[PDB]
C-alpha cells in the first residue's frame, strides 16, 4: 500500500459539513461559530464523533441517518491522521480553550 490514504475521507467530511453547516445557518451569528467550532473541535482532538454529531444537531441538525454518526468514526482516522501532519506545523497551546464546554 501507499502512505497517505487519509486524504480520502476528507472528501465526505469536508463535503458533508457543508450541508449540515447551512441546516442551521439561520439560528444566529453564533451557530455559524458553533458549526465552525464543532468541526475544528472534533479535529483538535477536543471533541468526538458521538459528541460532534450529538451537538451539531442543535446548530447543524445532525439527527439524520441512524448510521451517520458511525461513519465519521470510520473516516475519522483519515481526517485526524492526514490533518495531523499540517497540524504539527502549528502546534500551539490548546490549553487555552476558547469555547470550554461540559460535553
Amino acid at each position: 500500500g501507499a502512505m497517505g490514504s487519509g486524504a480520502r475521507q476528507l472528501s465526505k467530511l469536508k463535503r458533508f459539513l457543508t450541508t449540515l453547516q447551512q441546516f442551521g445557518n439561520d439560528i444566529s451569528p453564533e451557530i455559524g461559530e458553533r458549526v465552525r467550532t464543532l468541526v475544528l473541535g472534533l479535529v483538535n482532538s477536543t471533541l468526538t464523533i458521538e459528541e460532534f454529531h450529538s451537538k451539531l444537531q442543535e446548530a447543524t441538525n445532525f439527527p439524520l441517518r441512524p448510521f451517520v454518526i458511525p461513519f465519521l468514526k470510520a473516516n475519522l482516522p483519515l481526517l485526524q491522521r492526514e490533518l495531523l501532519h499540517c497540524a504539527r506545523l502549528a502546534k500551539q497551546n490548546p490549553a487555552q480553550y476558547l469555547a470550554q464546554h461540559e460535553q
Binding site: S11, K12, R15, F16, T19, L20, L64, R65, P66, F67, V68, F71
Partner: peptide, 18 residues
C-alpha cells in the same frame, strides 16, 4: 444510487423512504 452518495449515505433518510 449515485450523486452526492457520500452526502446521502449519511444525510437525509426520510426524504428517500417517503
Amino acid at each position: 444510487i449515485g450523486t452526492d452518495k457520500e452526502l446521502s449515505d449519511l444525510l437525509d433518510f426520510s426524504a428517500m423512504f417517503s
